[PDB]
Design a protein around this ligand. Structure first.
Ligand SMILES: CCCCCCCCCCCCCCCCCC(=O)OC[C@H](COP(=O)([O-])OCC(O)COP(=O)([O-])OC[C@@H](COC(=O)CCCCCCCCCCCCCCCCC)OC(=O)CCCCCCCCCCCCCCCCC)OC(=O)CCCCCCCCCCCCCCCCC
Ligand SMILES: CCCCCCCCCCCCCCCCCC(=O)OC[C@H](COP(=O)([O-])OCC(O)COP(=O)([O-])OC[C@@H](COC(=O)CCCCCCCCCCCCCCCCC)OC(=O)CCCCCCCCCCCCCCCCC)OC(=O)CCCCCCCCCCCCCCCCC
Ligand SMILES: COC1=C(OC)C(=O)C(C/C=C(\C)CC/C=C(\C)CC/C=C(\C)CC/C=C(\C)CC/C=C(\C)CC/C=C(/C)CC/C=C(/C)CC/C=C(\C)CC/C=C(/C)CCC=C(C)C)=C(C)C1=O
Ligand SMILES: CCCCCCCCCCCCCCCCCC(=O)OC[C@H](COP(=O)([O-])OCC[N+](C)(C)C)OC(=O)CCCCCCCCCCCCCCCCC
Ligand SMILES: CCCCCCCCCCCCCCCCCC(=O)OC[C@H](COP(=O)(O)OCCN)OC(=O)CCCCCCCCCCCCCCCCC
Ligand code: HEM
Ligand code: HEM
Lengths: 106, 32, 54, 62, 81, 379
């Protein structure tokens, strides 16, 4: 595979990640996704610990935005430590919807 | 345990009259 | 000058009311902002903590 | 050691809301006169001679 | 879902607050307030300003070109003779 | 023993809408203009009602009536200026009220967003018929141009124009019906505004972050009352400064000369708030093309929710979309500026470029960059 292009792709993605300010508030990537019915069901399937963590980090972000403050540098989220915890659940829900729609047309 | 909880210091935000944890706040109440 | 009056005979009165408005705003705007800060202080100083079972 | 001015103003007036309203309206009565007179004097002092009330002297009482 | 009694389900969170009368209305508004505003301005300066600068350049040139057009043409009179 | 605001039917509504309304705590000033809009409406209504007690809606005495208001009616000049200046403030807040939704993604509330489009069109009509009431040179001719714009209809054309005019041209009958329509529509807008708030309450307000705010909701009575009471004070400060120091800044002369059907001023430019659309019209040589452009413009707002492709509401976390947004705003500023300038070579070409750039950015660039940002996030 392409090495220089892949490294350039990784570099620009990391640059874009730092440009987005949600890491400044301790938010993970999966917290910012718009909450449509599919996301609502996906959240309903989360285990209690991840659900509890998600709610608290959202509260902290809202609280910080309240006073126009920013979390300290050392506590910013890092590009390599992020875990896409919500990806498997959302994918399964979307696939189920596609199967239902495919059946419904015939 | 519920006893490990203790309120973090708000000294920075407190009024000058009630900064210290020694003098009663009752007298300053009317003024504040 | 006479023509400027004939097209605006409320000139002097308009500016007098403006003068009073300026001084009244100067007194009021800081006061109302102070009340806003007073009420909102409880939220701006709020501190949060997260203590899961472990 | 004297009790602060604000403390006295609170106990006698602000503690009871009815007196709090009474002092407000009396203050409005007084401040209205004071503010109006002060502002008018300032405006006139900015424009001596221009305002016609300062010109009446040159022609009055025939 | 529309009443404070039942909106969400949270757990294991604590909050601390002080009364309005026990704290200053302008705390650290000289040492901690101004720098935060400067952070806000700096963090979003290049995302907005430069575009509006282009607008100003387009506005100035335009006016200049418009007036430049009304100037008389010396090349339309050299031969008129 | 229980609170009396939870039993009386009239107090239940006030409690729901005003006192115990759950509202996000992190909403910024952008969420204040909503209230201000209603406040401004309430001002206009009262200001206009007092002007109606001395206005004669006739083509031969309307202009003289206004002159009499400003010279003989006690504090008539201030009332007239407050009405005129308060209309510009309405649009300023209205444009900023619409921009917030565009930026933060509030259009996802279909019902509320669509009701707003209707409210915008209703307010635009109210302001146009109000501006013709004074019966000045600009008023007379501005109505003529805008009313002759319906002749582009394929087969009906003239019929609508003559029907609206109540005759073969613009004259007293047109003035009278416009006066009545001006009077009534604002009250219709009030009913629409209640429907606007109705559909809103089912879901609630959207926070700047775009994440669900159900964990940080607070009551409205103690916090946003004072916060919205401070905004209204600033709104009044701006309005009173405009009225008491620069009464005629956002207006235009030639409205103080009697309307002449024969004479016509050269520039004849419309009001500032109806300038961006005016340039869009002039950019297309065809009449039918221009009118379609004007309409297609407003229609874009209805189509914007369908064009959304990103997996986030707010553009706060999408800087490329932010840059496009601000470029679009600058384009609107250029359109307004061009509308204020005469028809000439540089202005005409610039207007055409601005118009095409406007449409292309909304219809093409925004969806493409949104997908690109989804790619760099490994969505
Ligand atoms: C809210 C905004 C809506 C405004 C509604 C009414 C507008 C009237 C007003 O000015 O006050 C409200 C509004 C209050 O904003 P906010 O609710 O506190 O923060 C949310 C903002 O939308 C966004 O705030 P943010 O922190 O998330 O984003 C950063 C933003 C932060 O903006 C600010 O820090 C300006 C407000 C500072 C405090 C204002 C009160 C004390 C003075 O940075 C900038 O504004 C800089 C932009 C480029 C400036 C170029 C050089 C200008 C000189 O004031 C402004 O935003 C000023 C707008 C004009 C630009 C000023 C740039 C600095 C001078
Ligand atoms: C003695 C000398 C005293 C000098 C005092 C200077 C500091 C003034 C101050 O404390 O401002 C708050 C500000 C702190 O603001 P923050 O709460 O951290 O951030 C949010 C803002 O307050 C802004 O967010 P906010 O929620 O606190 O207030 C926003 C508010 C506007 O808030 C305002 O501050 C308006 C201006 C009132 C100034 C009162 C100063 C009182 C002291 O706008 C609205 O909510 C209504 C918008 C309605 C728009 C209507 C448009 C009609 C056209 O103080 C500062 O540290 C920055 C001051 C910058 C001064 C630069 C001087 C360079 C030399
Ligand atoms: C030259 O200068 C000028 C301009 O400039 C060019 C101007 O302009 C103007 C201005 C004037 C005009 C255009 C005239 C405008 C009209 C007027 C003055 C008339 C004023 C009065 C009114 C409209 C009031 C009449 C209507 C009334 C009371 C309507 C009441 C009905 C309702 C509430 C029902 C509607 C309800 C709701 C929420 C909104 C719609 C319905 C809904 C459920 C939501 C709809 C959407 C959906 C479910 C979403 C569907 C789904 C999804 C994803 C998207 C689907 C996408 C697909 C592609 C299928 C002037 C004068 C001018 O001189
Ligand atoms: C220039 C433009 C004008 C301003 C336009 C926009 C409005 C300004 C911003 C909002 C200001 C709200 C009023 C100031 C704060 C306030 O007093 O809140 C009520 C406050 C809030 O509670 P409080 O704690 O401030 O005071 C009540 C408690 N005691 C009395 C013990 C101090 O309550 C009162 O003031 C109650 C007394 C009102 C008396 C009214 C007398 C009327 C008589 C009629 C006969
Ligand atoms: C507009 C006021 C003049 C520009 C001042 C600078 C500015 O407003 O910054 C844009 C601001 C960014 O802030 P934010 O959205 O909260 O996220 C990043 C930082 N927190 O985000 C915003 O303020 C977006 C405001 C959009 C609606 C008002 C501007 C659009 C007007 C269109 C006409
Ligand atoms: C013309 C008179 C109008 C009035 C009186 C009015 C009134 C209001 C008020 C008071 C709010 C609450 C503000 C908030 O909670 O942020 C609001 C919200 C809203 N308005 Fe209007 N509005 C008007 C026009 C419009 C227009 C033209 C649009 C165009 C889209 C619009 C779209 C919206 C939307 C989407 C919201 C919800 C914002 C959110 O949920 O964050 N409104 N309106
Ligand atoms: C949103 C609501 C309204 C808007 C936007 C609006 C707008 C306007 C505008 C821009 C003008 C012309 C100002 C000028 O030429 O300087 C005007 C004139 C007028 N409007 Fe309205 N108006 C509204 C509501 C009302 C209402 C409810 C009445 C009820 C009587 C009213 C009565 C009048 C009158 C009498 C005039 C004549 C102005 C004059 O004689 O100078 N308006 N309006």
């Amino acid at each position: 595979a392409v090495s220089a292009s892949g490294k350039w792709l990784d570099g620009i993605r990391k640059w874009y990640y730092n440009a987005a300010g949600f890491n400044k508030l301790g938010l993970m990537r999966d917290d910012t996704i718009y909450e449509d019915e599919d996301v609502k069901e996906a959240i309903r399937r989360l285990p209690e610990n991840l659900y509890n963590d998600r709610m608290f980090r959202i509260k902290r972000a809202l609280d910080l935005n309240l006073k126009h403050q920013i979390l300290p540098k050392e506590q910013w989220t890092k590009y390599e430590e992020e875990n896409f915890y919500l990806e498997p659940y959302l994918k399964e829900v979307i696939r189920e919807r596609k199967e239902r729609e495919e059946w419904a047309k015939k | 345990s519920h006893t490990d909880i203790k309120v973090p210091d708000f000294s920075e935000y407190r009024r000058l009259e009630v900064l210290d944890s020694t003098k009663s706040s009752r007298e300053s109440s009317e003024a504040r | 000058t006479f023509l400027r009056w004939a097209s605006e005979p409320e000139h002097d009165h308009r500016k007098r009311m403006g003068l009073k408005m300026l001084m009244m705003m100067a007194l009021l705007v800081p006061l109302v902002y102070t009340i806003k800060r007073h009420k909102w202080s409880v939220l701006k100083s709020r501190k949060l903590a997260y203590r899961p079972p472990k | 050691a004297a009790a602060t001015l604000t403390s006295k103003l609170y106990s006698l007036l602000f503690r009871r809301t009815s007196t709090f309203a009474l002092t407000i309206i009396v203050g409005v009565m007084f401040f209205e006169r004071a503010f109006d007179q002060g502002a008018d004097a300032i405006y006139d002092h900015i424009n001596e001679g221009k305002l016609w009330k300062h010109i009446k002297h040159k022609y009055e009482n025939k | 879902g529309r009443e404070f009694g039942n909106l969400t389900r949270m757990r294991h969170v604590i909050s601390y607050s002080l009364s309005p009368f026990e704290q200053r209305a302008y705390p650290h508004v000289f040492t901690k307030g101004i720098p935060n505003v400067l952070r806000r301005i700096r963090e979003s300066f290049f995302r907005v300003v430069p575009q509006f600068v282009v607008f100003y350049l387009i506005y100035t040139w335009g006016t200049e070109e418009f007036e430049r057009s009304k100037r008389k043409n010396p090349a339309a009179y050299e031969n008129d003779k | 023993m229980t609170p009396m605001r939870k039993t009386n039917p009239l107090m239940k509504l006030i409690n729901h809408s005003f006192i115990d309304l759950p509202t996000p705590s992190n909403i910024s000033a952008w969420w204040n203009f909503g209230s201000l809009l209603g406040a401004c409406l309430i001002l206009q209504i009262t200001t206009g009602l007092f002007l109606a007690m001395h206005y004669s809606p006739d083509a031969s005495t309307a202009f003289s009536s206004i002159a009499h208001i400003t010279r003989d009616v006690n504090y008539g000049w201030i009332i007239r200026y407050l009405h005129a200046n308060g209309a510009s403030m309405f649009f300023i807040c209205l444009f900023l009220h619409i921009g917030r939704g565009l930026y933060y993604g509030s259009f996802l509330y279909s019902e509320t967003w669509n009701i707003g489009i209707i409210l915008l069109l209703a307010t635009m009509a109210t302001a146009f018929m109000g501006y013709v009431l004074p019966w000045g040179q600009m008023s007379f001719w501005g109505a003529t141009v805008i009313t002759n714009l319906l002749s582009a209809i394929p087969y009906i054309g003239t019929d609508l124009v003559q029907w609206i005019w109540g005759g073969y041209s613009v004259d007293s009958p047109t003035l009278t019906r416009f006066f009545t329509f001006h009077f009534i529509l604002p009250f219709i807008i009030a009913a629409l505004a209640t429907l606007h708030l109705l559909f809103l309450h089912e879901t609630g307000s959207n926070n700047p972050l775009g994440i669900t705010s159900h964990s940080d909701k607070i009551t409205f009575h103690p916090y946003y009352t004072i916060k919205d009471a401070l905004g209204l004070l600033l709104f009044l400060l701006s309005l009173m400064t405009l009225t008491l120091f620069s009464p005629d800044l956002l207006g235009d002369p030639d409205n103080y000369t009697l309307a002449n059907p024969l004479n016509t001023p050269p520039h004849i430019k419309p009001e500032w708030y109806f300038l961006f659309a005016y340039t869009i019209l002039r950019s297309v040589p065809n009449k039918l093309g221009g009118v379609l452009a004007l309409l297609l413009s407003i229609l874009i707002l209805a189509m914007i929710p369908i064009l959304h492709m990103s997996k986030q509401q707010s553009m706060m976390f999408r800087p490329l979309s932010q840059s496009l947004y601000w470029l679009l705003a600058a384009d609107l500023l250029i359109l307004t500026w061009i509308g204020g300038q005469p028809v000439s070579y540089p202005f005409t070409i610039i207007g055409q470029v601005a118009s095409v750039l406007y449409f292309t950015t909304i219809l093409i660039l925004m969806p493409t960059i949104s997908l690109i940002e989804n790619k760099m996030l490994k969505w």
